[PDB]
Amino acid sequence: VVANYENASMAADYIKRVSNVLPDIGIICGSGLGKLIEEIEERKVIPYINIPNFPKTTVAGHVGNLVLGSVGGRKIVAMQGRLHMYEGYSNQEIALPIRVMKLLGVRVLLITNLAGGINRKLKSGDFVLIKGHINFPGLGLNNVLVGPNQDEFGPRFPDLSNAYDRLLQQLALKIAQENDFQDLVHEGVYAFNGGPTYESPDESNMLLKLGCDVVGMSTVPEVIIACHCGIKVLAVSLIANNSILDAENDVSINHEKVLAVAEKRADLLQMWFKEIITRLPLD
Amino acid sequence: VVANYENASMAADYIKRVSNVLPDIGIICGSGLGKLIEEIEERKVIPYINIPNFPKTTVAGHVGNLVLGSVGGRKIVAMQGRLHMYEGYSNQEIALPIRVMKLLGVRVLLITNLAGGINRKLKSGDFVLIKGHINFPGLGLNNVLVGPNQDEFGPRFPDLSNAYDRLLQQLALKIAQENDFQDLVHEGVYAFNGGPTYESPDESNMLLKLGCDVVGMSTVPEVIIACHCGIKVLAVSLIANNSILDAENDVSINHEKVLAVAEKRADLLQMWFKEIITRLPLD
Amino acid sequence: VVANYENASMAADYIKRVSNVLPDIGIICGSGLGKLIEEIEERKVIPYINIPNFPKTTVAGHVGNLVLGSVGGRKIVAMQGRLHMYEGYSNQEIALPIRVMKLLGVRVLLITNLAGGINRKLKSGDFVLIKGHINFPGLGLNNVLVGPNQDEFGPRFPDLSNAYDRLLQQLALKIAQENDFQDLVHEGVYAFNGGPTYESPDESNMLLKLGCDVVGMSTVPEVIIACHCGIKVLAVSLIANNSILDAENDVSINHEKVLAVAEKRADLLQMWFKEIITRLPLD
Fold it and tell me: Which of A140, A271, B225, B265 could form a disulfide with B98 if both were Cys (CB 3.0 to 4.6 A apart)?
């Protein structure tokens, strides 16, 4: 199924009819960071498998629902079950849910992920406001926009200079300051490692040379599709480990250690994002 | 359709029969730089859609003709309508037109493109003679030659040390000197960004660290297919913007600004290439 | 055919029945380095084309046999005919032979390749014990593990910190010292260039900046599949040329010069690996 206008329109029309929610804000959560989606009020849960033209996720399995409702006095739509390109999803499959969000009325997309620290100062448990990225798949002819352009959604050649909205970054930091946890909050450049192997020790060392602060396997494709269709983005990485120190010390990373850090910060991150939502422009 | 010997041969035979031109020189023009193709004398225009085994371009649309005839006293063939890999064309589709040029008798291929400046000295409107490249798709398993080798055209493992012919570079510079515009002409390494998003600000900064002078989304695949089958190449980038300064100053790029720079230099570039053609070896 | 548990199991069962060999050690040889496979005692030769679910290699052609038997008092299985991703093989095709080795009982995989020197000290004819890698295809969404994970073989997110077993490196070096050729043996980081064009001169220069010691077009995919399923790896590059010096001096590489270096060192490399096999743990 192509992520085109007719196909996204049919998905959006089904979602509107079933939910009776018109959302202004979209949310995509990293692994183990899904608590916010559980605090959604008057929730409507729509399985991906019921939505016309939505991508098939049963090979990967695990949950796949759109959840719509209210949080922090605002109407939102959340992806419960994220699509990652290391699973083998096509550009069309990644793009279609975000384009449906655009047609549902989403103007701001909030994204979290778990990532490895490349800046030597970053500690496990820190938050990084992403201010820019290095898209290795994009440089290498695997950009999520490769293929015919869908002109109905955006231009052939997007500029990504404002992909990570500066005012949303400033708002997120302001709220951390008001709540006295700004000592956890950094800003940084995210390197997109297609995955699914963790960055090798020598890859980490290369990324340090190239100016990256964090590394992960997600987020950049959604950011690009959102930027292409005019949706503002705030993206926040939770640091699971410091990959540069691990490289220098011969220490391994594993998904279990990673999920343990998400458990440590999930509630704070939920409280932070709920307050961001309440403080977003009504426009 | 594979870009193999039988299939390229059938395309070449059709082109020869219809045009009655045997060309020595091939031309592929960047966006907005197609004026030379309009100065071709005794022209024969052959729509791609009429040529056996030529790639289908109707999803992207826009013009797709081979134009054969005389320029500057020489027989040439030009691609009016270029195939870019960010459109989703396969390796076989990119390779087939250049291999047909080889069978038509092309010995030299002249290419122009629009590109972003990474060297801080490069100004909008400057020309860069390309002397080498950094092929990010190639390093990342998206090289245009991935797949079975077509032994009839060239070796399994091409060396690209002389991909950009030194004597053609020297000839191009000599002509710029004779016409007193050498102050516009630089030489440089081209970084191939698969596209279609413009290089992000942090990507630009990375390319500066890695020794690149310019960045763009084209040219390198054609250069590799031409080098593989023994066709000499001259490739010239027109600088549309300085991406490193834009990154440092938070300024966006857009395709419209880009096409405005092509309009500014198109006539000079046409005059330059016409004189290059007239001055090429008869061999 | 997917490289899944049922399909690898059917291949392994056929191989066991036909060979009557249960191997502990696997061997994959670089081009022109296949002499060891000729010293295998009580050999059983099984054409890839006879093995259920094995990948089709007739488009590339050339030899494709599994050879099982004894070397150095140990039971081994060797791939006579290697699958390279620049040929266009899918992730599933690359992964399946290594996963069959796992099911046959392989605990250690020995790999050789021919590679270009990026460290300025490396000479043609030197050996490099690989201690780490920079996986450009992996960073760029062409990792050999992209696709659904096969949970029966290994985790969704492998860590590669110990991908190149340290004790095997130490054993290989010890044996070189005992035989007084340690002056040929270096250790280094391998950059995986998807290929099949050789690294361009400016690509070589970039790799030098990024900390790479050698560059080649193989090995890293097999290492990742082996690491994923718990097989220990020793990988040794034979330096065919110094690519950084060639870049600095405008000298070309060609496959013929490369095969001439393999001929020069093939017998020593065979003797070295035979002694490594004899000295491996019985566990």
Answer: B225
